[PDB]
Symmetry: C3
Subunit: 82 residues, 3 copies
Amino acid sequence: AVLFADANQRGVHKHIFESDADVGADIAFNATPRSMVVLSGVWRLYREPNFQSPYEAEFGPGIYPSIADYGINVIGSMKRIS
Amino acid sequence: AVLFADANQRGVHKHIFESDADVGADIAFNATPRSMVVLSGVWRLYREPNFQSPYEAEFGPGIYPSIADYGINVIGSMKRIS
Amino acid sequence: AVLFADANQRGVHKHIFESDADVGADIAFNATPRSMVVLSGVWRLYREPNFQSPYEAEFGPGIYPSIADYGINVIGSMKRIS
Ligand SMILES: [Fe+2]
């Protein structure tokens, strides 16, 4: 997956491989993600680090130009569930 | 596709998924692209935002270390056509 | 392949396509890499530019959260050998 700081896949970005227990700990991505591309698999997003406080919406492959539309504000962590 | 600020796939880079109607709206990519990698599909590049004023050259998968050679100095938008 | 400035796939990153005879030539990759993801192919890493002074370790697809564990500090160049 790829996270983007701004909507419509703009701004600084961050590559996710299988999972990230602490998205906010990356110094090169000092931003809350505002859009997302899922390349393969189905993913669960979490408000907090270490896979706590999951969002209800799960994300299969696709382009998500404004994840705030899905209720997503902060992504503390995320992982492939299938 | 991937755009790069410098020739030969160096400098800040920008990932394009399917299309970008406004490359220049990306503040994190404050540069004219000078090289490009196409990973899949064939792409059309445009001088202006919103898929207007296309360049004639179309780009299939490959590594393009100096897109100025193709007469491309600014990319206002781009999209996968196949 | 993807090079990361920080361990555990964090920090500024750099995409490698088939090979790079001079990794250090990239002004935007302002650091010695500490982790790497190989997406496809098997890669040889070198201490010097232009594929001189190879490391003995060869890297197939996978996630390598600390390449120092493999005795790798500087990557002057790298290329696929398959
Ligand atoms: Fe990237």
